[PDB]
Amino acid sequence: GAYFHDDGFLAFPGHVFSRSLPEVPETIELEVRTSTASGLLLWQGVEGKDFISLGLQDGHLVFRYQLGSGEARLVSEDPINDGEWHRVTALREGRRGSIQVDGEELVSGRSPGPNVAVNAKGSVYIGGAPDVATLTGGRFSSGITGCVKNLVLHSARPGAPPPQPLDLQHRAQAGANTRPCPS
Numbered sequence: 001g002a003y004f005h006d007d008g009f010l011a012f013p014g015h016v017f018s019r020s021l022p023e024v025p026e027t028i029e030l031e032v033r034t035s036t037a038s039g040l041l042l043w044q045g046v047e048g049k050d051f052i053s054l055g056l057q058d059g060h061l062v063f064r065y066q067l068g069s070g071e072a073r074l075v076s077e078d079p080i081n082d083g084e085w086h087r088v089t090a091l092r093e094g095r096r097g098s099i100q101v102d103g104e105e106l107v108s109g110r111s112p113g114p115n116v117a118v119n120a121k122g123s124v125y126i127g128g129a130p131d132v133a134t135l136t137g138g139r140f141s142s143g144i145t146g147c148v149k150n151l152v153l154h155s156a157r158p159g160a161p162p163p164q165p166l167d168l169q170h171r172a173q174a175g176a177n178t179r180p181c182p183s
């Protein structure tokens, strides 16, 4: 697992999320541990307004993304801010998205309007970011403090490639204020 602090992060290549057209089922899965009430868990924006992000808001997990005609917001029922490990599964196909925490009833919804694709080829940020306020366009002012493990970034296009937890140490790209995290 990977530990983060003071906006620490780990960056991965935007091809982990190899998107298509028609839109194809998108899977994000991870295990988090943190005492953070507000902060950035994941962000991929275009490097143009399209993005995808997972964050902490009032302890609550939030799934947000923009496809061109308005954001989707999906917030978990309770905070997962308790420093105990929590499984978060965020899924999206086109504008339809959902989140599930552990075994809690899944929250579902969509983005409004006709846009249906995330045109974002930027790096995928986890944990934090070099400068969060700029990257997130004002939506987050910090990363989280804690762990992430069994990160799964899957795009499910007809051939390529099977959905399994990414190796955080060698399968990364950028990185700051981060160290291996035990469990």
Ligand SMILES: [Ca+2]
Pocket (backbone or CB within 6 Å): 050, 067, 068, 115, 116, 117, 118, 119
């Ligand atoms: Ca778009």
